[PDB]
């Protein structure tokens, strides 16, 4: 706008951002990496490098140490090559076959109209920048140059070991200066389903709707150690003590919008004698009540509803209504275990995410995250205990790996000290409640250890895709900082 003469090419540390303008001119959305690894590998040829590809189309680079460090050390730089195809909704980008034009606004580079790939457009330009610098003394090295994070990760677990050397990995994929991250969480989906059958509402039965909502909600992985409230259980939990007592019977139960979220809404629609009318209505209005007592703090918008609408139907047959409900409640849900290992991180969860009723099936579905694979499988037999006392169905799927936390491994307490040589204090090392294309990476070569950082992108995966340049400059700094400091192994 008003650096209108400025070129990206220009910008500090030079050799990694001219990489950076020349990875934006070879397009490459998810799925469509060719282009752009070939232009890396014959690259990488023509500097005499030795590159080599897998058969799912991961890229590795070889570079030998700098005279000094020959006794080497291993590293590993990594980074993904794909990009995210979206555009603003009302700019012309054939994504397939167009360059992101990206330009300098301010303290940030952004492309108009069009997501800007900086991520890790500012990662593998930086692992190109590494291997054609002459003056970064480092020990021998590998670039792994991974193939879709943003559909599936399918590059991720493309390959196995036997392909790298050096038990240390550099992911350049997080987004935040001084974030770092030591590990992360795996996951499962999992669905509980019920073969029901109905009986029809018995005479006077009133048919009422209630409803639980204003929960704050948020997402099973990064929100689950707060005290947020899950729908589907609080309306589980007051069936469970009361509706016998109550003498009601169900018709309808649906919850949540997605396994990946902390479900905010949720509701019931059940059958009752018209007696119980105000009993309920009082019980529930009790029930509502204990709860804002309970959650309030956390919890500060809890509304619920009880509305009626008398429609057929078909409740559910008793026995099924029964096996039901004390599933949904003895099942478990929210954190199972806090990591010891560091300093008040959860270890495991799970999250009763969606509930939907049809005639003849009650499905429940849940989404159980953990760090430890171990822990996880754990939770996937306690679901699957319940699920066999209940008579119901689960399957298992969309499983992929966590990241275990080795607290004062070799890397995390170098970067951690090299970063503070550089900087007068620490950075804000971490641990995801969320899957990152590290996590596959400890499949094969849980023998390496490893850490993620980067430079600070803001709004990735949008138009708005906007990167700070003056933090590209740091990266790239403790980027250099550490290659030097990494230690020997004879
Ligand atoms: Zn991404
Ligand atoms: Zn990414």
């Known amino acids: 706008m008003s650096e209108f003469h400025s070129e990206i090419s220009t910008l500090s540390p030079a050799p990694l951002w001219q990489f950076f303008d020349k990875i934006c001119s070879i397009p490459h959305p998810s799925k469509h990496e060719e282009a752009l690894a070939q232009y890396i590998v014959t690259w990488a040829t023509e500097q005499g490098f030795d590159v080599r590809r897998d058969p799912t189309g991961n890229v590795f680079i070889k570079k030998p ?19 995210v195809p979206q555009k603003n909704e009302d700019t012309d980008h054939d994504f397939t076959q167009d360059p992101i034009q990206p330009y300098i606004d301010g303290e940030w580079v952004t492309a108009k109209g069009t997501t800007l790939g900086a991520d890790n457009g500012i990662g593998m330009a930086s692992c190109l920048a590494v291997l054609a610098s002459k003056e970064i003394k480092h020990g021998p090295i590998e670039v792994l140059l991974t193939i879709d994070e943003e559909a599936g990760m399918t590059g991720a677990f493309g390959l196995e070991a036997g392909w790298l050397k050096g038990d240390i990995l550099l992911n350049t994929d997080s987004e935040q200066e001084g974030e770092v991250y030591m590990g992360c969480a795996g996951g499962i989906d999992g669905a509980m389903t019920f073969d029901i059958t109905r009986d029809a509402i018995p005479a006077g039965f009133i048919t009422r709707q ?64 018209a007696e119980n009318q105000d009993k309920l209505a009082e019980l529930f209005n009790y029930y509502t009540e204990l709860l804002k007592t309970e959650l309030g703090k956390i919890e500060t918008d809890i509304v619920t509803f009880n509305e009626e609408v008398a429609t057929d139907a078909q409740v559910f047959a008793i026995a099924d209504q029964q096996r039901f409900i004390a599933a949904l409640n003895a099942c478990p849900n929210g954190v199972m275990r806090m990591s010891d290992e560091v300093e008040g991180v959860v270890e495991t969860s799970l999250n009763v995410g969606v509930i939907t009723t049809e005639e003849n099936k009650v499905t429940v579905l849940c989404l159980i995250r953990s760090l430890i694979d171990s822990g996880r499988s754990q939770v996937e037999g306690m679901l699957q205990s319940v699920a066999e006392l209940a008579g119901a169905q689960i399957e298992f799927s969309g499983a992929y790996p966590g990241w275990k936390p080795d607290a004062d491994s070799e890397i995390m307490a170098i970067f951690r000290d090299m970063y503070e040589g550089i900087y007068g204090h620490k950075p804000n090392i971490m641990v995801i409640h969320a899957g990152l294309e590290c996590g596959l990476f400890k499949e094969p070569y849980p023998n390496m250890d490893m850490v993620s950082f980067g ?29 030097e400091a990494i230690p020997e192994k004879a």
């Open 65 to 83: 140490a700098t005279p000094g460090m020959e006794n080497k050390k291993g590293v590993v730089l990594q980074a993904h090559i794909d990009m």
């Open 210 to 273: 209630l409803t639980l909502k204003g929960l704050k909600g948020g997402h099973s992985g990064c929100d689950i150690h707060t005290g947020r409230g899950n729908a589907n259980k609080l309306i589980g939990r007051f069936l469970a003590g009361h509706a016998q007592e109550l003498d009601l019977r169900l018709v309808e139960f649906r919850g949540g919008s997605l396994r990946n979220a902390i479900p905010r809404e949720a509701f019931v629609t059940v059958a009752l004698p």
């Open 455 to 483: 430079p600070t992108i803001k709004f990735p995966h949008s138009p708005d895709e906007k990167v700070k340049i003056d933090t590209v400059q740091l990266f790239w700094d403790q980027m250099v900082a550490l290659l």
